[PDB]
Amino acid sequence: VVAAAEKTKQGVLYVGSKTKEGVVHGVATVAEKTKEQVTNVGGAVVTGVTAVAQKTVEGAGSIAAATGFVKK
Amino acid sequence: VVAAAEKTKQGVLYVGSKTKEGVVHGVATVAEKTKEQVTNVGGAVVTGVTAVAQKTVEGAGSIAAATGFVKK
Amino acid sequence: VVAAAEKTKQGVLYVGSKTKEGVVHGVATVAEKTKEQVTNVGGAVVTGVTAVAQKTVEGAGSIAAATGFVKK
Amino acid sequence: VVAAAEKTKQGVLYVGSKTKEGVVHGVATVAEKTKEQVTNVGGAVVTGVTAVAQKTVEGAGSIAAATGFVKK
Amino acid sequence: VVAAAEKTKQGVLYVGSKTKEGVVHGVATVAEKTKEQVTNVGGAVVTGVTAVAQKTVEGAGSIAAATGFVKK
Amino acid sequence: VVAAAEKTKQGVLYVGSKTKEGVVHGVATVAEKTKEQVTNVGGAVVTGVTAVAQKTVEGAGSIAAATGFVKK
Amino acid sequence: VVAAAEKTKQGVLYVGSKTKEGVVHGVATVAEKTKEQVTNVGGAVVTGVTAVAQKTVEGAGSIAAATGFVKK
């Protein structure tokens, strides 16, 4: 899990939205009559109505991530 | 899981939306009468109504990720 | 889990939203009659109505992260 | 979990929102009749109505993080 | 958990919001008839109505963090 | 948990909000008929209506933090 | 838990808010019929209506912190 980013050196934009009665769910764990319920999150959960990402990483970016589940 | 990004050196845009009564679900784990329920997330969950990504990674970007599930 | 970012050297923008009656859920763990319920978060949970990220990481950025679940 | 950021050297912007009756939930752990309920958070939980991040990390930024859950 | 940031050397902006009847929840642990309930927080919980972060880390920033849960 | 920040050397801005009837909750631990309830906080809990952070860390900043929960 | 900050050397701004009927809660531990209830805080709990932080850490800043919970 190695993430390397390097950068070496020597206009009109628009996002529009008009939403009425919007119900948004991201990561959902709905259950009834269990004994175990595990929600392990190690990435990136981006929820919303206007989830907008613009002009990200203009230079060098490294988003190294890891997760695990061990049960014995 | 090695991610390498390198960059070496020596207009009109629009997204529009008009939504009424929008129901959006991302990662959903709906269950009844279980004993185990695991939701392991290690990537990227992007939910919304207008999930817009514009002009991302102008330079160098590395999004190395890993996940695992071990049960014994 | 190594994240390296390096940067070496020698316009009109808009996001708009008009939302009425918006219900947004991020990471949800809804359950009934369990015995264990674990929510381990180690990434990035970004919720909202206008979850906007603009011109992030102009230079060097490293977002190294890790998480784990061990049960014996 | 090593995060390194380095930077070596020798316009009009807008986010707008008009929200009525907005209910936003971030990380939620709703349960009934359990015995254990653990919410371990080690990342970044950003909730709101207008969760806006603009021009972050103009120089060098390192957001190294880690978390764990051990049960025996 | 090592976070290193280094920086070596030799416009119009706007966020607007108009919210009526806004209910925002961050990290919530709602439960009934349990015996244990642990909320361990070691990251960054940013809640609000206008959770705005602008031009953060102009120089060098290191946000190294760690957390753990051990039960035997 | 080592956080190092170093910096070596030899415009119009606005955030606006107009909120009516805003209820904001941060870290909440609501429970009924338990025996243990622990809320260990070691990060940064920023709640409000206009939670605004602007031009933070102009120089060198290190926000090293750690927390733990041990139960035997 | 080592935090080092070093700095070596040889415009118009605005935040506005107009809030009516605002109820803000930070870290809350609401419970009924328990036997133990511990609230250990070692980070930074910033609550308010206009929780504003501007131009913090112009030089060198180190915010090293730690906390723990041991029960046997």
What would you note in describing this structure?
- The structure holds 7 chains of a larger assembly.
- Chain A has 72 residues and is mainly beta.
- In chain A, 0% of the residues lie in helices and 56% in strands.
- Chain A has no helices and 8 strands.
- Chain A has strands at 2-8, 15-30, 38-41, 45-46, 52-54, 60-62, 65-66, 69-71.
- The interface between F and G is large, with 72 and 72 residues.
- Chains A, B, C, D, E, F, G: Keywords: Acetylation, Alzheimer disease, Amyloid, Cell projection, Copper, Cytoplasm, Disease variant, Membrane, Metal-binding, Neurodegeneration, Nucleus, Parkinson disease, Parkinsonism, Phosphoprotein, Repeat, Secreted, Synapse, Ubl conjugation.
- Chains A, B, C, D, E, F, G: The modification Phosphoserine is found at residue 62.
Total helical segments of chain A:
0
Largest interface between protein chains, with number of residues from each side:
A-B, 72 and 72 residues
The shape of chain A is flat
Write down the oligomeric state: 7 chains of a larger assembly
**Beta strands of chain A, count:** 8
Q: Share of helix among residues of chain A?
A: under 10%
Query: End-to-end distance of chain A, in Å?
Result: 24 Å
Please give the radius of gyration of chain A in angstroms. Answer: 19 Å
SSE order of chain A, one letter for each helix or strand = EEEEEEEE
- Structural class of the secondary structure composition of chain A? mainly beta
**Strand content of the residues of chain A, in percent?**
over 45%
Q: How can the largest sheet of chain A be summarized?
A: none
PDB class: protein fibril
Keywords: alpha-synuclein, Cerebrospinal Fluid (CSF), protein fibril
Entry title: CryoEM structure of amplified alpha-synuclein fibril class A type I with extended core from DLB case X
Chains A and 6 copies: Alpha-synuclein
